[PDB]
Amino acid sequence: SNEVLFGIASHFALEGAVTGIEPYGDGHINTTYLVTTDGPRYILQQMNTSIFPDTVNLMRNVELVTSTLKAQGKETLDIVPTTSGATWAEIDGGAWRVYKFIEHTVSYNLVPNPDVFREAGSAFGDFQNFLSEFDASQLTETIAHFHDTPHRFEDFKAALAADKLGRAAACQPEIDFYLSHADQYAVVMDGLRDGSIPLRVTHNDTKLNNILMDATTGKARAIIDLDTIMPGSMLFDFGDSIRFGASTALEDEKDLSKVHFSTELFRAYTEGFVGELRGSITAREAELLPFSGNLLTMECGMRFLADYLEGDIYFATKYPEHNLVRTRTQIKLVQEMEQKASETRAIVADIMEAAR
Ligand SMILES: Nc1ncnc2c1ncn2[C@@H]1O[C@H](COP(=O)(O)OP(=O)(O)OP(=O)(O)O)[C@@H](O)[C@H]1O
Ligand SMILES: [Mg+2]
Ligand SMILES: [Mg+2]
């Protein structure tokens, strides 16, 4: 309520007298408010400390990345300090932060067309490019092992072994798909480990609703939602974007005849992404762009299936078989990626040469 909210806002060095504070946006993790003043506007968020208990480390990650982008004249989340100079405030139990409102933007939920998907690729390619000289090792793992696929596979096997709901009996083909792909899961972790794949900043929630684009030009403006900034390989981010974004269907589509991996959307994202990162991407990274799609789609699928086997404790579900329906789309997508490897390899090689 306003009196509590107005009081909360008083903790921050706003550059305008507060005039209103109301719920804003469609975020589901933090609690987001729009602060209107006699002047500029702000985003005020109560941070979800159940999901992110370590506020100091999370905000440290956000400060490091945003400071680097700001230092280079790049638009990003701009933290407004507390009146005491901190990046966030402890208030009667809660953890609160303020960002300058990024004005004159729009954003998308579902991918509307290849052109917008290309611009999403451009947004994250630009993000990667301007962080190419940032020492990613300074960042902490806010969610440990987040895209450590071998670790996720161990978790999957534990859920399978426990079979607490006796659900394994009903999904043998899905289980065997993940078991049979076992020797593929370590490709990127091994690469990061031996230095053949660069350690880079990773965003880890590359969904389009985190890419603000200009309200008039439609061009990428800024990457937001920096809660999950961590070290990793950019292949984790690229692969996941391909996972959700190059599908012709929703993640929980029941009719598998409608679920396809679209090479047109793959080409669109890759054009935008590589177009901005051509001077930094390594040969090994380029080599793995198509496979990163397989990897992150398999990782996501195995997590859905593990959750199904464990009684749906991690992902929200709407009906008993929701996670099983989800895992099946991810399986369909990977098999198509496997079968179109010739095409995607050729697509990447062509885009690499064109970007020059
Ligand atoms: N600096 C900003 N300027 C303008 N709009 C913003 C800013 N930060 C967030 N938003 C908007 O606020 C809402 C919440 O965004 P954010 O991605 O930070 O939410 P979240 O709490 O991480 O939840 P989720 O992970 O579900 O998105 C979105 O509608 C987003 O468009
Ligand atoms: Mg978001
Ligand atoms: Mg978020």
From Swiss-Prot:
Keyword Transferase attributed: yes
Catalytic reactions of this protein: N-acetyl-D-hexosamine + ATP = N-acetyl-alpha-D-hexosamine 1-phosphate + ADP + H(+)
Thermal profile of function: Optimum temperature is 40 degrees Celsius.
Family stated for the protein in its record: Belongs to the protein kinase superfamily.
pH-activity note: Optimum pH is 8.5. Stable at pH 5.0 to 9.5 at 30 degrees Celsius.
The species this protein was found in: Bifidobacterium longum subsp. longum (strain ATCC 15707 / DSM 20219 / JCM 1217 / NCTC 11818 / E194b)
Enzymatic class: transferase
Domain called Protein kinase: residue spans: 18-356
Name of this protein: N-acetylhexosamine 1-kinase
